Design a binder for this molecule. Sequence first.
Ligand SMILES: CCCCCCCCCCCCCCCCCC(=O)OC[C@H](COP(=O)(O)OCCN)OC(=O)CCCCCCCCCCCCCCCCC
Ligand SMILES: CCCCCCCCCCCCCCCCCC(=O)OC[C@H](COP(=O)(O)OCCN)OC(=O)CCCCCCCCCCCCCCCCC
Ligand SMILES: CCCCCCCCCCCCCCCCCC(=O)OC[C@H](COP(=O)(O)OCCN)OC(=O)CCCCCCCCCCCCCCCCC
Ligand SMILES: CCCCCCCCCCCCO[C@@H]1O[C@H](CO)[C@@H](O[C@H]2O[C@H](CO)[C@@H](O)[C@H](O)[C@H]2O)[C@H](O)[C@H]1O
Ligand SMILES: CCCCCCCCCCCCO[C@@H]1O[C@H](CO)[C@@H](O[C@H]2O[C@H](CO)[C@@H](O)[C@H](O)[C@H]2O)[C@H](O)[C@H]1O
Ligand SMILES: CCCCCCCCCCCCO[C@@H]1O[C@H](CO)[C@@H](O[C@H]2O[C@H](CO)[C@@H](O)[C@H](O)[C@H]2O)[C@H](O)[C@H]1O
Ligand SMILES: CCCCCCCCCCCCO[C@@H]1O[C@H](CO)[C@@H](O[C@H]2O[C@H](CO)[C@@H](O)[C@H](O)[C@H]2O)[C@H](O)[C@H]1O
Ligand SMILES: Nc1nc2c(ncn2[C@@H]2O[C@H](COP(=O)(O)OP(=O)(O)OP(=O)(O)O)[C@@H](O)[C@H]2O)c(=O)[nH]1
Ligand SMILES: N=C(N)NC(=N)NCCc1ccc(I)c(Cl)c1
Ligand SMILES: [Mg+2]
Lengths: 98, 48, 459, 113, 19, 98, 347, 320
Amino acid sequence: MSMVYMNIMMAFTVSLVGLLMYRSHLMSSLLCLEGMMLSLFVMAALTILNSHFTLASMMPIILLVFAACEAALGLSLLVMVSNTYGTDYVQNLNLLQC
Amino acid sequence: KFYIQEPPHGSPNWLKVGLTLGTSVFLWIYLIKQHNEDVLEYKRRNGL
Amino acid sequence: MLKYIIPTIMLMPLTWLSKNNMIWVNSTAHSLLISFTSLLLMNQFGDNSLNFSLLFFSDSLSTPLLILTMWLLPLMLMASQHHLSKENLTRKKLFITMLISLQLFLIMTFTAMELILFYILFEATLVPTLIIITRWGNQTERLNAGLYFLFYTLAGSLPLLVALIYIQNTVGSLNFLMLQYWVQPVHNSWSNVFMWLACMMAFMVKMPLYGLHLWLPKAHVEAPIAGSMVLAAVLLKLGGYGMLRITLILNPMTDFMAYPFIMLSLWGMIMTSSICLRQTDLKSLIAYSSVSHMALVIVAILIQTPWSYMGATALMIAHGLTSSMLFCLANSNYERIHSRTMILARGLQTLLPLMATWWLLASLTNLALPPTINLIGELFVVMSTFSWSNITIILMGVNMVITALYSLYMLIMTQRGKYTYHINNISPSFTRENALMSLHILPLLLLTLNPKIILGPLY
Amino acid sequence: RATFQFLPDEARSLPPPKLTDPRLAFVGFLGYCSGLIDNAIRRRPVLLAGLHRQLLYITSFVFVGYYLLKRQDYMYAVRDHDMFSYIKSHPEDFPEKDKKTYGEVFEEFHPVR
Amino acid sequence: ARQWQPDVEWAEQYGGAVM
Amino acid sequence: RWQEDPEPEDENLYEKNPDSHGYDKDPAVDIWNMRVVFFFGFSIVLVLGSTFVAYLPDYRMQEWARREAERLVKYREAHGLPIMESNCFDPSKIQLPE
Amino acid sequence: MNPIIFIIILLTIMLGTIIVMISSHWLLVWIGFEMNMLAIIPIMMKNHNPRATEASTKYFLTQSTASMLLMMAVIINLMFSGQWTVMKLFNPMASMLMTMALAMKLGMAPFHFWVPEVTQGIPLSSGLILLTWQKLAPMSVLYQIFPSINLNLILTLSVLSILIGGWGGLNQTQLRKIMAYSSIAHMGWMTAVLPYNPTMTLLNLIIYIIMTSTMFTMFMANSTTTTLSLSHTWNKTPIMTVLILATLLSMGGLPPLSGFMPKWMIIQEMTKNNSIILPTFMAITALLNLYFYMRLTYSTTLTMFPSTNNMKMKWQFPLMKKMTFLPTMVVLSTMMLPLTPMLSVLE
Amino acid sequence: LQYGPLAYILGEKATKKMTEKSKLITVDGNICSGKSKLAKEIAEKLGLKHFPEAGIHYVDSTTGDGKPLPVQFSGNCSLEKFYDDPKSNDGNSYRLQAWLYASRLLQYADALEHLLSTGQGVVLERSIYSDFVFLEAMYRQGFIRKQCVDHYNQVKKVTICEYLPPHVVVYVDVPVPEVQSRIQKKGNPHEMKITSAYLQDIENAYKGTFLPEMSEKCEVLQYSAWEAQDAEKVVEDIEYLKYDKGPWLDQNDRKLHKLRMLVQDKLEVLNYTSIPVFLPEVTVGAHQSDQVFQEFTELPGRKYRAGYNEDVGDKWIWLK
Ligand SMILES: CCCCCCCCCCCCCCCCCC(=O)OC[C@H](COP(=O)(O)OCCN)OC(=O)CCCCCCCCCCCCCCCCC
Ligand SMILES: CCCCCCCCCCCCCCCCCC(=O)OC[C@H](COP(=O)(O)OCCN)OC(=O)CCCCCCCCCCCCCCCCC
Ligand SMILES: CCCCCCCCCCCCCCCCCC(=O)OC[C@H](COP(=O)(O)OCCN)OC(=O)CCCCCCCCCCCCCCCCC
Ligand SMILES: CCCCCCCCCCCCO[C@@H]1O[C@H](CO)[C@@H](O[C@H]2O[C@H](CO)[C@@H](O)[C@H](O)[C@H]2O)[C@H](O)[C@H]1O
Ligand SMILES: CCCCCCCCCCCCO[C@@H]1O[C@H](CO)[C@@H](O[C@H]2O[C@H](CO)[C@@H](O)[C@H](O)[C@H]2O)[C@H](O)[C@H]1O
Ligand SMILES: CCCCCCCCCCCCO[C@@H]1O[C@H](CO)[C@@H](O[C@H]2O[C@H](CO)[C@@H](O)[C@H](O)[C@H]2O)[C@H](O)[C@H]1O
Ligand SMILES: CCCCCCCCCCCCO[C@@H]1O[C@H](CO)[C@@H](O[C@H]2O[C@H](CO)[C@@H](O)[C@H](O)[C@H]2O)[C@H](O)[C@H]1O
Ligand SMILES: Nc1nc2c(ncn2[C@@H]2O[C@H](COP(=O)(O)OP(=O)(O)OP(=O)(O)O)[C@@H](O)[C@H]2O)c(=O)[nH]1
Ligand SMILES: N=C(N)NC(=N)NCCc1ccc(I)c(Cl)c1
Ligand SMILES: [Mg+2]
């Protein structure tokens, strides 16, 4: 494939590894989810624009709409985690081991 | 014995009893009528 | 078979709609009437089996087993109604329902013409049997006994299911009549070695085979009396009946695949007869006696000769009536002294004379006194095994010596000697108990007059 | 055959299940058992309570079951129709064999000694 | 005697966090 | 410990009913239970069932086979034929391999 | 939650699943999953406690990650085929990503860790939806893409799910975790037969949903969530202990009960393809499921556990819970085996 | 239409039926402190429903025909036996206390259901909020073990969190020596055995815990013995309360609907009073429970759901 696809596919993989390798802040990982959506938007937009798939031009817009619903949902849960524990640390969410 | 509180089901719910028997009769009549259609249609398509 | 399936089902409404004080009277009376009509199954022909429909058939192998099954249900009811007297009324009705549902699965299992239908019913008997053992057993160990019973059976049954479906894919049918004409030989291969094992291991566990028998001393001891009666008399014979049918499609591979299992049986019976000499629990002693007797059935089925199949069929019927009678005899003692320890109550012939006669008759049939059908079956198996290899007479002969020792040891220890001084509640035998004993022994001894109806298809 | 259709029109050339079909009777029996379980879990007299409710349990089971059996029978007719039409279209894959009698076919004998 | 039924000791086998 | 009923005492059916048959506490049910067991068990199944078995019509046709064998032996010895031939099937209908 | 709001959110859960099942376009399939994920989170948080907050957080992170992988697969498929039609994928890397994404959404092993924890952390009513309705959308997608699924991958996921589901349930005393590990095991049977006969996948799915709904409804009726609280049921509603026993035996696959039907048919379809080792291994491993089902029957129906004095106060009140469809479900859960040839309606 | 989400949607909302006179009043005090009489007068003057203190047989009074059941169906727990032998070996002291808490929990749910469904206030005599004073008194005298106290607290935590405290808490402060004289004059032989240290513990708990706690969330009226005699003056006090504090101000139709769905489902109300914690005082062996449960079903009108018992004149069963 063309060389741009190398860097966009690399960007998605970097964000995916970022998502799968948590640190402490839950917000750091929610950022990696938004990054994953950014790389999909760019990769989808390039393919659609290059091929002149006219009707598909709206598809990246729809992707962003549900990226925001995902982001808003992630922040709402972060608020409730923050209220319960005083931090958004993910190691506090271990009650359900038992 | 004679309940200190009137039971919720102390007396029949006649609106329900009527609907339940009415549905049973309707479904049975529909089923029988449908079956007769199928038997008649089946013989016609098969020249019987 | 609908003339037996439907009335057997109708026993369930009969029990549930009976007056609270007539559940035993009504069910016992009507299960006896069903038992009567089962004699119509003896319309057997020399060449053709009795083939009722696409689903069910009867032949000289299944017919005696069916008659034994339907006869046992009345006897299990009389044996049970004493120790369930305090039981809640609805729980009494459920207990009877389990016995009826067990009979229904058994009479269909022995007559199913298609092997996969046999498999489903063969397996369906686990449920009522498991419930009977675990719900209505007396001891803590009944829970563990149910688990052993369940998983020993299923560990062998699941490979059988795969094998049967594989046989249907390749042959195109599992109907037993078709398998008689479409059977092809099994040629040596590692693939066929495991087809053979999957076809035989489920039935060996049920027999049980020596080595795979550990579930039976636990299950046959923890069960309530009715559970033990059916487990010993009939359920063990699902293994023998299954083997007798499926070995049709396993030739000639049975020639060399039988060797490890003949060795386990020939040596197993001597090992399990010797165990009975040092058993401290009367019910456990009887259970280990069943393993010793069913070892002969396994050998007879595997060597696959006309005499051994006749002997195997006779042994299965004779053992069913004898082993069931012995459990009932031991239960009558247990219902008096509330212990299974054999040495606890001694010299009982002094306190219970007539019941000591039943003990003697049960013991004599167990040690195969001629011309009982126990001896007829055991002798036919020895005749055919001698031809298979003359040296087997040594192992058969030794087992016959040991079997007499433990059969009379149990008789002597419990019935003879001096009564235990401190046991003072040995009430006289009830009519129910005497009748229950005579309904085992009398049919067993009558069959000597006409033994051809329990010798199976090869007579 | 027809897309997202429960009973394609071609299914009307088949006979309907009889209302005395043994499978339909079993389905009706299941409806009866459902009615009894309904009474039992609500601690009502199991046999007697709410016969109208028990009737609807039986009728609704039979009603649905009749159409399932009608579709079950149809789908097995379609399986047979497809299989035989395929056999007609590819004779060389399904040759009719020459059948030999047992007097001619050699089978090995394995003694049971 | 009478039929055994689980007592407290038996029942607490199933009351822990894990089996 | 806990709140549990003590093991109930043993009940000897003969104390209340010396004529007990061992079936039921109720003397009337107890007599009926004995009656059905004996009549249906001994009088019907065992007595009539034994009579039925004795008069089974030629069970598995062993009597017809003896009559048939006598007919064959008579015919074969009169006509000089062998009593029994080693071949079950006529070898003219068999095609040996090779 | 306002009753009208609750109904609207439930209809959005169903609409999302239905969108996945009627869509011919990958974008609408992805939208359906997103809409479904959106509406289920408030159902998980409906009781507002730290355990429900943790459960919902773990669910969102897992589902949202899987959706990214799903959308990645769709975009790769678009690059190598120039179309969005829901069907076989045209790139093996797109097939791996979509298969892993659907396995994540299903909670199949080794992506299974969230199922026991999320189910434990939410109410029984919400767990019922999670373990039944939520399997429909990922399964319907697999039903359409299976021709392009890697056979080794899907059978590896199926085998690991049966083992881990069976082993995991052995150590549980909480009912919700027992149902979760049971669900993991049953998912393995569904996807094991998928490459061979997808019709048998639907039968297993339908029968599993009926039995799972029956169990959750009976747990809800008595408001029981532990083994020990379920052991008091004999001293309140004896009929319920018998229904629980029958369903648990059915779920274990014992003849002549309904739950034996899917295992029976799946073994048949696998042996027809000369798959002998795998169905034998699966059936034997499923005995672990039967073991810890049997333990429940022991403590629930086949013995009488100790009770408490305050229980006597419960004798004086009738069951008030809706128990919707329970009489029908339990009959279907147990008595369907004589009608097995009805599976052709699913063709 | 039985109350549910459908009834809520169609309009059955608590704020429609609830006025300024829809209050939950609890009357508390020591033994023989005059609670009963004061509670009855307050209810009659304010026009509220009166709930006589929940005793052992409270639950019987609400189900069946409303008559007390034999004592085996209350666990055989006896208040008289508690006075005769407070340190009984059969665990009667705590078993009685655990039974009484559950009876109060049930009565509170019934009071709340009446208040939310009709808008008429109610008057109680003690409640789940003040039941612990007896437990604390029992523990300080050594009548129960620390484990009984732990069990009581586990049950309370998971039950009392679901309800709302009373609008008004009325306390009648009668000093212990006066109470001892009052108990002495009453006459019943068993209650005469109460020791002053036991009554002082009830008082210490009432003032050391209950009242400081209730004050932050309820209106508290603390009367002496003489003020309490004239119920008219107490009613005047209640009529001019401001009601400026407590969790009732934050309630809305959405929240009271969730509360109504709980209190009308008594098995849900009592769910955690039988948690599987095996204290000897409250654990019942399987053989005993089975026998008692059978006998309970053989009582008149208890085999079946209310309205399906033909033995007591229920008709149309085949259509019900
Ligand atoms: C011709 C019919 C033949 C019967 C076929 C049975 C097939 C299995 C059907 C299972 C469904 C059974 C019905 C559901 C249970 C309802 C009955 C019950 O729960 O309690 C018993 C009840 C009497 O008790 P009560 O609650 O007080 O009501 C008074 C009514 N007079 O009600 C009664 O009075 C009696 C009602 C029947 C009792 C059913 C007992 C359950 C049996 C389960 C065993 C498994 C079935 C056998 C296995 C083989 C299946 C063919
Ligand atoms: C696969 C082969 C086997 C075939 C399987 C087929 C399964 C599907 C078949 C349907 C199964 C469900 C049948 C339910 C029958 C019982 C319904 C009943 O008796 O309801 C009585 C009454 C309500 O009746 P009502 O709704 O007023 O009737 C008028 C309808 N317009 O009110 C009551 O008291 C009923 C309370 C008990 C109901 C349990 C909760 C479910 C609610 C059902 C609502 C009504 C269902 C109507 C069924 C019609 C279906 C055609
Ligand atoms: C049809 C072809 C397909 C074949 C598949 C098998 C069909 C059967 C499917 C079963 C489905 C479940 C329906 C079974 C109905 C059970 C009826 C029953 O349990 O009786 C009611 C009774 C309830 O008691 P209660 O309401 O309080 O009345 C006063 C008595 N105490 O119950 C009790 O009091 C019992 C309380 C004590 C617990 C005893 C437990 C041991 C008995 C279990 C028997 C049922 C086992 C069913 C499993 C399948 C059996 C093959
Ligand atoms: C969780 C992991 C996240 C990773 C995200 C990054 C994903 C990147 C996707 C890149 C897709 C490349 O897709 C890959 O293209 C090459 C073409 O050279 C194909 O290569 C193959 O097919 C073509 C012909 O069909 C030939 O080159 C040859 O037969 C073979 O090499 C691969 O079959 C395909 O899988
Ligand atoms: C309780 C357990 C009882 C266990 C009983 C063990 C029985 C062992 C039976 C061994 C015989 C199996 O059957 C044997 O299989 C091999 C398959 O490799 C066949 O042989 C085939 O493979 C082998 C390779 O090993 C080649 O030598 C041979 O050329 C080929 O035809 C043999 O023709 C057949 O004789
Ligand atoms: C649990 C107790 C264990 C005790 C130990 C038991 C050991 C049992 C070993 C199983 C039998 C193995 O030995 C088996 O012998 C028979 C011959 O009789 C062979 O049978 C085969 O080979 C012979 C010649 O060898 C050929 O006529 C023919 O191809 C076939 O019959 C099997 O290929 C072989 O596998
Ligand atoms: C072809 C099929 C033949 C089937 C035959 C089945 C026979 C079963 C025999 C059971 C006979 C029992 O018949 C019995 O008769 C009397 C009156 O008639 C009934 O009524 C009696 O019950 C009580 C018993 O407590 C008696 O004290 C009292 O004299 C009377 O009221 C019994 O309730 C009933 O049990
Ligand atoms: N152990 C225990 N006894 C209680 C409890 N509530 C009431 N009692 C007892 O029940 C009896 C009646 O209590 P009181 O109402 O306070 O005494 P009274 O004679 O009715 O005087 P009044 O306050 O006017 O009603 C007393 O013996 C109390 O000890 C309780 O929660 N625990
Ligand atoms: N094995 C598959 N994956 N496909 C499949 N079901 N093949 C079998 C063909 C079939 C079976 C039943 C019917 I009814 C019909 Cl019409 C067609
Ligand atoms: Mg008072």
